[PDB]
Amino acid sequence: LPGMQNLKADPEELFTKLEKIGKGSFGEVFKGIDNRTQKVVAIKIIDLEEAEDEIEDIQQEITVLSQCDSPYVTKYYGSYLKDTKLWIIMEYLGGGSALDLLEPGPLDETQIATILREILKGLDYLHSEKKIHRDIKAANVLLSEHGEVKLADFGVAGQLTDTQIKRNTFVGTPFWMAPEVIKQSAYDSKADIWSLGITAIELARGEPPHSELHPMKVLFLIPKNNPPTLEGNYSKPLKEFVEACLNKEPSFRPTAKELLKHKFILRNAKKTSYLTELIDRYKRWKAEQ
Numbered sequence: 001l002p003g004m005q006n007l008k009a010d011p012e013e014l015f016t017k018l019e020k021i022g023k024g025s026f027g028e029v030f031k032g033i034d035n036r037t038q039k040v041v042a043i044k045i046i047d048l049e050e051a052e053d054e055i056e057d058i059q060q061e062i063t064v065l066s067q068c069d070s071p072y073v074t075k076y077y078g079s080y081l082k083d084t085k086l087w088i089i090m091e092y093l094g095g096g097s098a099l100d101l102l103e104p105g106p107l108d109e110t111q112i113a114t115i116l117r118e119i120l121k122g123l124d125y126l127h128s129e130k131k132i133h134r135d136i137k138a139a140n141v142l143l144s145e146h147g148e149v150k151l152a153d154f155g156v157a158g159q160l161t162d163t164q165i166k167r168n169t170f171v172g173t174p175f176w177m178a179p180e181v182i183k184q185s186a187y188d189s190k191a192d193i194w195s196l197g198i199t200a201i202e203l204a205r206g207e208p209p210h211s212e213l214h215p216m217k218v219l220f221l222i223p224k225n226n227p228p229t230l231e232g233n234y235s236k237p238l239k240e241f242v243e244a245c246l247n248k249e250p251s252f253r254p255t256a257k258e259l260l261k262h263k264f265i266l267r268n269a270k271k272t273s274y275l276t277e278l279i280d281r282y283k284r285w286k287a288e289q
């Protein structure tokens with residue numbers, strides 16, 4: 001396990017575990033304070049006794065995280081054992097997920113473009129490292145209190161090599177999964193680009209396509225239907241960004257690097273600092289109730 005700490009280190013001493021902020025890839029996630037620096041962190045806690053077929057996946061997740069050095073990937077600080085519980089210390093992103101920031105109401109196209117541009121920067125980094133996220137969706141897109149946008153939850157992240165230029169494993173969240181991943185055909189990083197497209201619709205409309213239906217229906221709906229399109233009063237460049245991602249033929253989908261030059265992004269995206277308005281809005285909203 002990369003970043004595994006000295007097992008004599010007691011994380012209950014080194015860290016103040018605060019409120020739960022979410023349920024994660026495995027186990028729960030908490031807000032916490034690093035007791036040495038007084039920096040806030042995120043703590044993922046997993047019971048190893050309450051495992052197992054997950055520990056390979058937990059190894060794999062932590063391995064992948066430890067191999068990423070990008071402003072666009074959640075930082076991983078190390079892991080601690082406390083009796084049966086694994087404490088995974090993560091970068092704390094105080095804005096929550098893009099999905100949280102949607103709860104007060106719709107995004108405008110500038111905010112959508114900005115968030116998509118930053119996701120594309122993350123996807124470009126990952127894909128350049130032959131890594132595939134495979135669970136891109138709004139809930140896995142996090143923001144710092146400054147409005148920086150980062151990719152999270154590498155629970156099902158894949159790795160490509162010289163040997164394996166392609167993967168076949170059935171992973172992801174159904175609504176966001178690419179048809180070729182659902183069919184377990186040979187696939188690569190283009191799968192993430194399909195997921196990005198679904199996420200673009202999610203960011204624009206609040207939900208992915210087929211969100212009313214039972215997840216098992218999409219197992220045939222997605223491979224046999226025409227891809228979703230963004231329906232509603234949204235700009236033509238936003239609709240074409242979505243369609244460019246959502247092609248059933250993976251070689252017809254652009255790369256992350258290409259989509260960064262897409263007209264929707266260029267014409268509408270602004271500096272990420274402006275996303276603070278979106279976090280302030282969430283605050284005010286969450287005040288009431």
Ligand SMILES: CC(=O)NCC(=O)N1[C@@H]2CC[C@H]1c1ccc(Nc3ncc(C(F)(F)F)c(NC4CCC4)n3)cc12
Nearest residue numbers: 019021022023024029042074090092093095096100152
């Ligand atoms: C009591 C209270 O108000 N707590 C804060 C809270 O509930 N928040 C804030 C704003 C929305 C929601 C929330 C969710 C997530 C975070 N931050 C965060 N940072 C890093 C991770 C990381 F573990 F990926 F690194 C992470 N993961 C959780 C698992 C579901 C998302 N969440 C912050 C918040």
